[PDB]
Amino acid sequence: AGTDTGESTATSIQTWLSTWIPIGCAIAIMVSCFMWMLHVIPASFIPRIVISLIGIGSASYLVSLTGVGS
Amino acid sequence: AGTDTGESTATSIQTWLSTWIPIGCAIAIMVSCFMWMLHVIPASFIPRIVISLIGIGSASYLVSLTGVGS
Amino acid sequence: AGTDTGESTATSIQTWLSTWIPIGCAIAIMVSCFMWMLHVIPASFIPRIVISLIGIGSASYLVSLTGVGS
Amino acid sequence: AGTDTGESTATSIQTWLSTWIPIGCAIAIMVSCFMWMLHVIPASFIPRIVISLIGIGSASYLVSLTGVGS
Amino acid sequence: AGTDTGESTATSIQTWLSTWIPIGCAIAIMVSCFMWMLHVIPASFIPRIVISLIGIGSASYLVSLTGVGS
Amino acid sequence: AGTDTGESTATSIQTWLSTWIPIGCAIAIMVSCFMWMLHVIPASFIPRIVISLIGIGSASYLVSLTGVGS
Amino acid sequence: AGTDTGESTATSIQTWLSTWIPIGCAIAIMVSCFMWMLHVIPASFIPRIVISLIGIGSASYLVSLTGVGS
Amino acid sequence: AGTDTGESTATSIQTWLSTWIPIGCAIAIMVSCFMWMLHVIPASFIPRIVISLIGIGSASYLVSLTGVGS
Amino acid sequence: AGTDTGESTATSIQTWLSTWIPIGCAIAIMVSCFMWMLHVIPASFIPRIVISLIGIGSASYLVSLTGVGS
Amino acid sequence: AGTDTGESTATSIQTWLSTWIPIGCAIAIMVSCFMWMLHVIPASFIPRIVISLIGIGSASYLVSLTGVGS
Amino acid sequence: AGTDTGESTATSIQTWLSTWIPIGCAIAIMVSCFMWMLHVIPASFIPRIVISLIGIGSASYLVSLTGVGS
Amino acid sequence: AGTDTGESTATSIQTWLSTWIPIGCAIAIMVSCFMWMLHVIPASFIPRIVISLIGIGSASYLVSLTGVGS
Amino acid sequence: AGTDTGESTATSIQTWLSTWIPIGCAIAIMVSCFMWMLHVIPASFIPRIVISLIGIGSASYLVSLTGVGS
Amino acid sequence: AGTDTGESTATSIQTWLSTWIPIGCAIAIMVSCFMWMLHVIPASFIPRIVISLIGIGSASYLVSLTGVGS
Ligand SMILES: CCCCCCCC/C=C/CCCCCCCC(=O)O[C@H](COC(=O)CCCCCCCCCCCCCCC)COP(=O)(O)OC[C@@H](O)CO
Ligand SMILES: CCCCCCCC/C=C/CCCCCCCC(=O)O[C@H](COC(=O)CCCCCCCCCCCCCCC)COP(=O)(O)OC[C@@H](O)CO
Ligand SMILES: CCCCCCCC/C=C/CCCCCCCC(=O)O[C@H](COC(=O)CCCCCCCCCCCCCCC)COP(=O)(O)OC[C@@H](O)CO
Ligand SMILES: CCCCCCCC/C=C/CCCCCCCC(=O)O[C@H](COC(=O)CCCCCCCCCCCCCCC)COP(=O)(O)OC[C@@H](O)CO
Ligand SMILES: CCCCCCCC/C=C/CCCCCCCC(=O)O[C@H](COC(=O)CCCCCCCCCCCCCCC)COP(=O)(O)OC[C@@H](O)CO
Ligand SMILES: CCCCCCCC/C=C/CCCCCCCC(=O)O[C@H](COC(=O)CCCCCCCCCCCCCCC)COP(=O)(O)OC[C@@H](O)CO
Ligand SMILES: CCCCCCCC/C=C/CCCCCCCC(=O)O[C@H](COC(=O)CCCCCCCCCCCCCCC)COP(=O)(O)OC[C@@H](O)CO
Ligand SMILES: CCCCCCCC/C=C/CCCCCCCC(=O)O[C@H](COC(=O)CCCCCCCCCCCCCCC)COP(=O)(O)OC[C@@H](O)CO
Ligand SMILES: CCCCCCCC/C=C/CCCCCCCC(=O)O[C@H](COC(=O)CCCCCCCCCCCCCCC)COP(=O)(O)OC[C@@H](O)CO
Ligand SMILES: CCCCCCCC/C=C/CCCCCCCC(=O)O[C@H](COC(=O)CCCCCCCCCCCCCCC)COP(=O)(O)OC[C@@H](O)CO
Ligand SMILES: CCCCCCCC/C=C/CCCCCCCC(=O)O[C@H](COC(=O)CCCCCCCCCCCCCCC)COP(=O)(O)OC[C@@H](O)CO
Ligand SMILES: CCCCCCCC/C=C/CCCCCCCC(=O)O[C@H](COC(=O)CCCCCCCCCCCCCCC)COP(=O)(O)OC[C@@H](O)CO
């Protein structure tokens, strides 16, 4: 009697986040490198950025790799 | 019914930081060289400054190199 | 039938804080430098004071930069 | 309907600290020089004392230099 | 409603230290000369003792020379 | 036909509290400093005491600053 | 119709604490110095004891310095 | 209606500690000298033991020197 | 027409508790020290035990110190 | 009309714990020394074991030393 | 109405650990000597192994030496 | 006129739980050790498992030790 | 009147976990070694993996060793 | 009534990691050698890389060597 807005709403939210999450990732790299130059944080932040970027781009693939939502 | 201020807000914050982050980088180079002259810190700070400057200028390129936000 | 005291009350609170927040900032600089002389805290407090002062003076500009309240 | 004790309280606290902070600074110089004589700490404490004294005496000037509280 | 014990406490601590710090300085000179006789430490300790004694006796003068606490 | 005991009762309660609230504030400062000496609580209690004292003495002024009860 | 036991009760509690708080302060100094000898805690505890003792003896003066309870 | 066990309890605890703290101090001197013989720790432990012993024996005098508990 | 069992009942309950509360206090000291040995809880429990014992033995005196029940 | 099981129950619990708490203390010493050999924890655990053993054996004496339960 | 499994459980755990803790101690000696050959760690590990072995074999004796569990 | 099913029902419930509670205890040990390997929880879970196992096996004995149900 | 699914359900859950817990343990070893290569975590993770593996394989034996569920 | 995705999900995650963990290991060797050339880190990193590579390739074998998951 109505419209199913469950799948569409979830897809719309996913599309919206991808608009500005990538820009926020670039900000963190610039700010983190600045803090490292000032001797505020250790250098163990470099591997974190690469691993986090792997997870962000592989989010959809990882979920289906476990059999959920197929 | 409104305006999307997700991408614009992230871009505005990125533009603002680039106004004064470069000046802060020059301050660190001057202060770090002063501390080295006083025998307070080792000389291993020189490679750090070059590597940090590489990361700051390559932040946007590095993010898209991993496929995020394209 | 009455008076709108929403904008005025918020403005009055903002004006009151600016009277004594700046004096409190000077106290922290003096006390933090004293603790550093005593070998109680590391020197990574110096960049914090500059960054915090940037945020305090740019509070109004930063809010409107994101499109809120215009 | 009352009295504003925001600016006065902050000023009173600042005036009180300046009574005994300078005496504490002289104690640190005497004790630090003693520890250096005993071969307990390195000589990199001498530049710290001068820099800390610069910050303590310039606390008020530095805050207004950034535009806060004017 | 009470008594201010900020300046007095700092002065009392300064007076107490001067009672036994000078005796400790004489002990270091005697022990350091003994170690030098045994070929345990280099002779670069002699200039350190003179410079440390200059700093201990000039602690109060040096603090006010920078404008702090006047 | 009677007496209005609304404003008087509120004023009487306010006057009574001011008799012993200030003494209770001094107790907290003494006890809090004792706990800090014992390594039981962090040093972030010092700014709390100053801010709370500002609020207690400015209670009447703050209420009228928002236009209530004038 | 009764007796006001607000100011008296607060004063009585303050007087009681001053009987045994000073003895507890001496215990902490003795125990803290013992732990330092055993290489369990750093030497940054010495400035804490002096600052805490300043606060304990100045509790009443500090409260009235801000205008509360006068 | 009862007995005040605030001052007595604090005094009893102080008396108990002095029974075995001095013996523990002698153990540390013997063990620390052993570790030094084995080339495990530097010789900067010798000044620490003297300074700690000064603090332990002067705990009561130091507290009253600041005006607390008199 | 009957017997007043208000004061007697309260006194009887107080006497009963004092029979086994002290034994329970000794159990806590033994168990708390065991947990500390196992690195389960911090050492800030030691001051708590002394302060709690002061309160337990001074319960009757503290109540009458405030003027209640005299 | 019944039996008082307040003092007896507390005594029974105390006696039960002393059966196996001492064996648990020996386990901790053996395990802690093993972890130290593996370079997992610092050597500041040795003074903790001695102090904890002092507290466990002196639990009953310490409680009565403060006047509780006599 | 049941069985006391407090002393037995503690004894069983102690017996189990002694089965494989000694083998783990031999592994550490072999691995630590290997790291020393590679110039990765200093030679101050040799005294640690002897002292740790003394503590492991004397765990039960040390506990009863202090009067606990007898 | 009927049958007393009070003691029997309580005994039956106790017997049923002992069938699968022990298996659940083994699951927790396996899962807790897995979480520790992943750096999700601290190592203070090991003493908890031993103490909980002591309580489970001594439930009946502990109840009668206090005189209840005999 | 029904079927007892208490012991069977607990056994079924235990059997299911053992299917994939071992594979998860191998993943942690591979990932932990990778983080160590990157200088992100200390080397004290190696003893943890061995001890955790001992606990996982001995879960059933350890539970019955204490007398629970026999 | 469904599908068991416990073993398969764990296996899939293990297979995915092996795709890019080896490439990350080669990056660390290249970067670590660069830092060594610049006199930033000591040469004790060479044995770490070999030992970490041994652990990564032996993860599955080591787990079953202890009896887990067989
Ligand atoms: C994209 C690729 C980027 C690669 C990374 C950038 C590389 C830039 C060069 C530096 C490292 C060169 C290789 C290592 C040289 C060999 C190692 C060496 O000589 O050791 C020290 C450095 O000396 C040295 O060279 C010292 C001089 C090195 C610097 C050369 C001049 C550069 C400009 C100077 C202003 C800084 C500007 C920083 C931003 C660019 C000794 O010295 P000094 O006895 O003091 O004891 C310091 C301490 O030990 C005190 O405790
Ligand atoms: C898919 C697989 C991904 C794998 C993970 C990514 C790997 C990327 C490389 C980093 C780790 C390399 C292995 C470890 C190197 C050996 C360990 C080492 O050298 O240690 C520090 C790092 O130095 C170093 O190399 C420092 C340089 C390492 C980084 C190399 C250049 C990268 C670009 C730079 C901009 C960042 C962009 C981040 C996003 C990509 C010393 O340094 P620094 O004395 O400062 O004391 C810092 C601190 O100790 C201060 O408290
Ligand atoms: C908008 C952009 C803003 C950018 C952010 C502001 C930047 C302002 C400069 C600071 C960082 C400079 C770069 C880092 C310098 C290289 C790193 C360095 O030298 O390390 C320490 C700092 O030394 C140092 O320079 C110490 C001196 C640095 C400060 C220079 C003088 C400033 C005035 C002083 C009063 C404070 C006023 C704060 C408000 C302005 C060593 O020291 P110290 O052996 O003590 O061991 C401390 C600790 O390790 C003890 O545990
Ligand atoms: C606004 C700008 C401010 C700038 C900052 C202030 C500058 C004030 C001078 C100091 C640094 C000079 C540059 C560095 C000198 C070259 C480096 C040098 O010589 O090294 C050490 C210092 O020696 C030295 O000079 C030692 C002497 C330096 C101090 C000169 C006399 C000053 C008064 C003395 C009382 C202190 C009062 C502090 C408050 C003013 C050797 O020594 P020493 O073998 O002991 O091994 C110590 C350790 O290595 C033991 O582990
Ligand atoms: C209107 C505007 C009001 C503004 C608010 C009031 C401001 C008043 C100053 C305090 C904050 C200063 C800025 C922060 C200083 C930099 C931060 C710093 O040093 O950190 C700690 C504080 O040390 C410190 O300074 C400690 C000293 C700070 C206090 C200075 C003396 C004040 C009098 C003392 C009696 C109390 C009376 C309270 C009522 C007035 C270290 O310490 P401590 O190693 O112990 O580890 C404690 C913990 O971490 C243990 O777990
Ligand atoms: C109230 C005032 C109190 C003032 C404080 C007390 C002062 C008591 C004297 C000590 C410091 C003397 C001044 C410094 C001497 C000059 C500095 C010196 O010689 O350096 C080291 C100490 O040597 C030395 O003297 C070593 C000998 C110094 C001690 C003299 C005999 C004292 C009794 C011995 C039993 C301890 C009892 C401790 C409690 C009293 C070399 O040594 P060693 O090559 O080993 O490398 C150790 C390490 O570097 C290994 O890594
Ligand atoms: C109102 C104003 C008040 C101002 C605040 C009070 C000031 C009172 C002096 C202390 C700080 C002096 C300035 C800092 C000195 C320079 C810094 C310094 O030397 O560092 C440590 C302290 O050494 C030192 O001086 C140690 C000696 C400092 C103390 C001097 C004697 C005081 C009496 C002793 C009994 C305590 C009584 C406490 C209540 C009064 C080294 O040491 P140690 O190798 O052990 O490594 C400890 C750790 O690093 C181990 O992990
Ligand atoms: C009326 C007035 C009463 C005043 C209150 C009573 C005072 C009684 C003394 C305690 C506090 C002393 C001042 C603080 C000391 C300086 C602070 C200090 O050393 O810190 C810890 C305590 O160490 C320490 O001293 C530990 C030893 C302190 C206790 C001294 C022996 C007492 C008897 C022992 C049995 C208990 C009986 C309790 C009932 C009496 C370090 O330790 P540990 O590395 O373990 O890390 C623990 C944790 O951090 C682990 O997460
Ligand atoms: C109950 C009482 C127990 C007492 C404690 C046990 C005592 C057992 C002996 C050791 C300490 C002897 C006293 C100190 C010796 C004088 C100090 C000395 O020589 O210094 C180092 C040790 O050298 C040395 O002796 C090195 C040799 C010392 C060991 C002698 C052979 C022992 C067996 C070997 C297998 C280990 C088995 C461990 C378990 C038993 C130099 O060396 P190396 O240039 O390498 O720079 C290492 C580093 O500096 C690299 O950074
Ligand atoms: C009632 C009064 C009680 C008083 C309290 C008890 C006192 C019992 C002695 C210990 C402290 C002695 C004073 C401090 C010694 C000087 C300080 C010292 O040497 O430092 C460490 C301890 O070394 C050391 O002595 C290590 C040896 C100290 C222990 C001496 C043998 C005791 C038996 C051994 C089995 C344990 C049984 C515990 C229950 C009794 C170095 O070491 P290690 O390079 O490893 O770096 C560890 C870490 O830094 C690694 O991160
Ligand atoms: C009746 C009397 C019962 C008494 C109670 C039972 C006692 C059983 C032993 C444990 C405590 C030993 C005393 C404390 C040891 C000294 C303290 C110590 O070493 O600390 C941690 C534990 O390490 C350690 O020993 C870790 C090893 C301790 C366990 C020894 C092997 C036991 C079997 C293993 C499977 C579990 C089976 C559980 C059921 C029996 C460090 O570790 P790790 O760096 O990981 O940081 C963890 C965390 O800090 C991460 O955030
Ligand atoms: C399964 C069993 C595995 C066993 C573990 C692997 C073993 C692989 C060899 C290394 C250790 C050899 C034993 C120790 C040698 C004796 C000790 C020695 O010489 O000391 C340093 C290392 O020098 C040296 O050899 C330096 C050369 C050692 C390496 C030999 C060539 C290897 C390939 C190179 C690319 C890395 C690839 C890493 C992955 C395979 C001096 O140097 P350098 O003055 O620089 O001061 C560095 C620092 O002190 C600066 O602060």
Tab-separated table of N, CA and C in Angstrom, chain M residues 2-49:
chain	number	residue	atom	x	y	z
M	2	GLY	N	9.154	-33.429	27.795
M	2	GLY	CA	9.887	-32.865	26.681
M	2	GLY	C	11.273	-33.454	26.540
M	3	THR	N	12.199	-32.677	25.990
M	3	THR	CA	13.578	-33.100	25.809
M	3	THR	C	14.508	-32.119	26.505
M	4	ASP	N	15.533	-32.654	27.163
M	4	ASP	CA	16.526	-31.837	27.851
M	4	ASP	C	17.555	-31.364	26.834
M	5	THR	N	17.572	-30.064	26.558
M	5	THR	CA	18.500	-29.473	25.603
M	5	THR	C	19.476	-28.537	26.299
M	6	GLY	N	19.872	-28.886	27.519
M	6	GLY	CA	20.830	-28.086	28.249
M	6	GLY	C	22.258	-28.524	28.006
M	7	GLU	N	22.529	-29.815	28.193
M	7	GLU	CA	23.875	-30.324	27.948
M	7	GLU	C	24.192	-30.346	26.460
M	8	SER	N	23.226	-30.751	25.631
M	8	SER	CA	23.470	-30.835	24.194
M	8	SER	C	23.737	-29.463	23.593
M	9	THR	N	22.963	-28.454	23.997
M	9	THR	CA	23.160	-27.113	23.456
M	9	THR	C	24.535	-26.569	23.813
M	10	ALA	N	24.974	-26.781	25.054
M	10	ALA	CA	26.301	-26.323	25.452
M	10	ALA	C	27.389	-27.053	24.679
M	11	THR	N	27.229	-28.362	24.478
M	11	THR	CA	28.218	-29.112	23.711
M	11	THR	C	28.247	-28.666	22.255
M	12	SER	N	27.079	-28.407	21.669
M	12	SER	CA	27.024	-27.980	20.275
M	12	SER	C	27.726	-26.643	20.080
M	13	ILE	N	27.541	-25.714	21.019
M	13	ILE	CA	28.196	-24.413	20.917
M	13	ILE	C	29.707	-24.565	21.033
M	14	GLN	N	30.166	-25.445	21.924
M	14	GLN	CA	31.601	-25.675	22.056
M	14	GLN	C	32.191	-26.248	20.775
M	15	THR	N	31.499	-27.205	20.158
M	15	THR	CA	32.003	-27.810	18.929
M	15	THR	C	32.049	-26.799	17.791
M	16	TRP	N	31.053	-25.916	17.715
M	16	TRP	CA	31.025	-24.927	16.642
M	16	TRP	C	32.201	-23.964	16.740
M	17	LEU	N	32.508	-23.492	17.949
M	17	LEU	CA	33.578	-22.515	18.107
M	17	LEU	C	34.922	-23.091	17.685
M	18	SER	N	35.169	-24.362	18.001
M	18	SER	CA	36.455	-24.968	17.677
M	18	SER	C	36.669	-25.078	16.172
M	19	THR	N	35.615	-24.886	15.376
M	19	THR	CA	35.775	-24.955	13.927
M	19	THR	C	36.572	-23.772	13.392
M	20	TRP	N	36.320	-22.569	13.914
M	20	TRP	CA	36.914	-21.364	13.355
M	20	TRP	C	37.792	-20.579	14.321
M	21	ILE	N	37.768	-20.876	15.621
M	21	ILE	CA	38.713	-20.230	16.538
M	21	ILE	C	40.150	-20.544	16.155
M	22	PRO	N	40.532	-21.791	15.872
M	22	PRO	CA	41.922	-22.052	15.467
M	22	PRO	C	42.371	-21.257	14.254
M	23	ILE	N	41.504	-21.063	13.260
M	23	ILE	CA	41.888	-20.271	12.093
M	23	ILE	C	42.096	-18.816	12.483
M	24	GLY	N	41.252	-18.297	13.376
M	24	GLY	CA	41.445	-16.943	13.860
M	24	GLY	C	42.747	-16.762	14.610
M	25	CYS	N	43.199	-17.802	15.313
M	25	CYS	CA	44.473	-17.724	16.019
M	25	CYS	C	45.637	-17.583	15.047
M	26	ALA	N	45.585	-18.290	13.919
M	26	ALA	CA	46.645	-18.169	12.923
M	26	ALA	C	46.674	-16.773	12.314
M	27	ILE	N	45.506	-16.154	12.141
M	27	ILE	CA	45.456	-14.803	11.588
M	27	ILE	C	46.156	-13.821	12.517
M	28	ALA	N	45.922	-13.944	13.825
M	28	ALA	CA	46.533	-13.023	14.776
M	28	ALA	C	48.053	-13.128	14.755
M	29	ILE	N	48.583	-14.348	14.664
M	29	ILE	CA	50.032	-14.524	14.620
M	29	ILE	C	50.615	-13.824	13.400
M	30	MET	N	49.972	-13.991	12.243
M	30	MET	CA	50.460	-13.352	11.026
M	30	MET	C	50.362	-11.835	11.112
M	31	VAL	N	49.246	-11.316	11.623
M	31	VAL	CA	49.069	-9.869	11.700
M	31	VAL	C	49.979	-9.267	12.761
M	32	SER	N	50.112	-9.935	13.911
M	32	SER	CA	50.965	-9.410	14.973
M	32	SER	C	52.419	-9.335	14.532
M	33	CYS	N	52.892	-10.349	13.809
M	33	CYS	CA	54.261	-10.317	13.308
M	33	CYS	C	54.454	-9.184	12.309
M	34	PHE	N	53.431	-8.900	11.501
M	34	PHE	CA	53.504	-7.780	10.569
M	34	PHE	C	53.632	-6.452	11.305
M	35	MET	N	52.834	-6.252	12.356
M	35	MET	CA	52.904	-5.007	13.116
M	35	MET	C	54.262	-4.847	13.786
M	36	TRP	N	54.835	-5.948	14.274
M	36	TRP	CA	56.163	-5.899	14.876
M	36	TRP	C	57.212	-5.467	13.858
M	37	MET	N	57.115	-5.972	12.626
M	37	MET	CA	58.049	-5.571	11.581
M	37	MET	C	57.988	-4.075	11.314
M	38	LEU	N	56.818	-3.467	11.482
M	38	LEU	CA	56.618	-2.053	11.206
M	38	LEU	C	56.965	-1.165	12.390
M	39	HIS	N	57.403	-1.744	13.505
M	39	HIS	CA	57.783	-0.970	14.686
M	39	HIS	C	56.569	-0.284	15.307
M	40	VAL	N	55.442	-0.987	15.334
M	40	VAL	CA	54.207	-0.455	15.891
M	40	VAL	C	53.956	-0.967	17.304
M	41	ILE	N	54.333	-2.206	17.594
M	41	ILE	CA	54.092	-2.793	18.910
M	41	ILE	C	55.393	-3.414	19.396
M	42	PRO	N	55.546	-3.569	20.709
M	42	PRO	CA	56.757	-4.195	21.247
M	42	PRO	C	56.753	-5.696	21.005
M	43	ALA	N	57.872	-6.322	21.358
M	43	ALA	CA	58.048	-7.754	21.157
M	43	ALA	C	57.465	-8.591	22.284
M	44	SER	N	56.883	-7.969	23.298
M	44	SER	CA	56.264	-8.727	24.379
M	44	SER	C	54.993	-9.438	23.953
M	45	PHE	N	54.629	-9.417	22.669
M	45	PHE	CA	53.461	-10.162	22.216
M	45	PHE	C	53.768	-11.639	22.005
M	46	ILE	N	55.039	-11.992	21.792
M	46	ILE	CA	55.382	-13.394	21.539
M	46	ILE	C	55.019	-14.283	22.717
M	47	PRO	N	55.402	-13.974	23.960
M	47	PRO	CA	54.984	-14.838	25.076
M	47	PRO	C	53.478	-14.912	25.251
M	48	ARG	N	52.751	-13.847	24.911
M	48	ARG	CA	51.297	-13.879	25.027
M	48	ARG	C	50.674	-14.941	24.134
M	49	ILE	N	51.163	-15.080	22.902
M	49	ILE	CA	50.566	-16.037	21.979
M	49	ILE	C	50.747	-17.460	22.484
